[PDB]
Design a protein around this ligand. Structure first.
Ligand code: S8A
Ligand code: ZN
Length: 257
C-alpha cells in the first residue's frame, strides 16, 4: 500500500487515489506576499478546557493522540468557520533533518515539523461522514522549529518508547493540547484536502503564523519511531510529509495585517 518511500510515496498516490491531482489539494506553499488580509475574518475560538485525551496510536504513518469526540468537549469555531468542529486527534509530520518535515511551507521555507489538530464539523455527526463534505473538517496547523524545548510536548515525547511500531497504542489520558499552542492565534486559511490518502477535499485549513519551538532532543525522539510493525525490518518513521501541491484556483487569506 501507500507510504512515503520511493516506490509508494507521494508521487505514486494518484494511481490509487486520482484526486491526488485534484483542484484543491494540500499542503501548499503559503506566499506571504500574495496572501490577502481579510478584515472580515474573525478571531479563532479554540476551546480545549474540557478536552479529554484517551490514547496514543502509531498507525504506521504518524502517531495520533486521540480524544473523546462523543461530546462538544474540545472544539474549534470562529475564524473562517461556520458552526462547531470537534477535536478528534492531533498528530505531526516531521523530517529526517531539521531542514525539512513540514507539509505547508512559508515562502518556500520548510519547518522541522508540523502539528495538525484535526476537527470535524458537528453538523455531519461523525468523522466518516464529515470527510465526504467540502466543509467537513477544520485542521489547525502549527509549525515546529528547533530551538528551546516545548514543555507541553514532553509528555508526548516520553510515551513514544511504548508505541514504537505500527499498530501499537498506549493509554494517554489527561493530556492538555493547550500546551502545544503558540502565543498568537494569527493565521492563514484556505480550502484544501487531507494530506494522506484518501486525499479528500474536505478541509478548511487554518495554519498559524507563529511556530512553536521544540528542542532537538524532542524531535530526535520522533525520529526513533518506526513505520514498520514489530518483528519487521526497521524503517525509521521520518519524512512522513507530502510536498506542496499546486494552489490552482485558490486564494490564501490572512487574519492579520
Ligand atoms: O493530516 C491531516 O491533518 C488530516 N488528515 C488526513 O490527511 C487523513 C487521511 C486519512 C485519515 C485521516 C486523516 S486526518 O484527518 O488526520
Ligand atoms: Zn496531518
Amino acid at each position: 500500500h501507500w507510504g512515503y518511500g520511493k516506490h509508494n510515496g507521494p508521487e505514486h498516490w494518484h494511481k490509487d487515489f486520482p484526486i491526488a491531482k485534484g483542484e484543491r489539494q494540500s499542503p501548499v506553499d503559503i506566499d506571504t506576499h500574495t496572501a490577502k488580509y481579510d478584515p472580515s475574518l474573525k478571531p479563532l475560538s479554540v476551546s480545549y478546557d474540557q478536552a479529554t485525551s484517551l490514547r496514543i496510536l502509531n498507525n504506521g504513518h504518524a502517531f495520533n493522540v486521540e480524544f473523546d469526540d462523543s461530546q462538544d468537549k474540545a472544539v474549534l469555531k470562529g475564524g473562517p468557520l461556520d458552526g462547531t468542529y470537534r477535536l478528534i486527534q492531533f498528530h505531526f509530520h516531521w523530517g529526517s533533518l531539521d531542514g525539512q518535515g513540514s507539509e505547508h511551507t512559508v515562502d518556500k521555507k520548510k519547518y522541522a515539523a508540523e502539528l495538525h489538530l484535526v476537527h470535524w464539523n458537528t453538523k455531519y455527526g461523525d468523522f466518516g461522514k464529515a470527510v465526504q463534505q467540502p466543509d467537513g473538517l477544520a485542521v489547525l496547523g502549527i509549525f515546529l522549529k528547533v530551538g528551546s524545548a516545548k514543555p507541553g510536548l514532553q509528555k508526548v515525547v516520553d510515551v513514544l518508547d511504548s508505541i514504537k511500531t505500527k499498530g501499537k497504542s498506549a493509554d494517554f489520558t489527561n493530556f492538555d493540547p493547550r500546551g502545544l499552542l503558540p502565543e498568537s492565534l494569527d493565521y492563514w486559511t484556505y480550502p484544501g484536502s487531507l494530506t494522506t490518502p484518501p486525499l479528500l477535499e474536505c478541509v478548511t485549513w487554518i495554519v498559524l503564523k507563529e511556530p512553536i519551538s521544540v528542542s532537538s532532543e524532542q524531535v530526535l525522539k520522533f525520529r526513533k519511531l518506526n513505520f514498520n510493525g514489530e518483528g519487521e525490518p526497521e524503517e525509521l518513521m521520518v519524512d512522513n510529509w507530502r510536498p506542496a501541491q499546486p494552489l490552482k484556483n485558490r486564494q490564501i487569506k490572512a487574519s492579520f495585517k
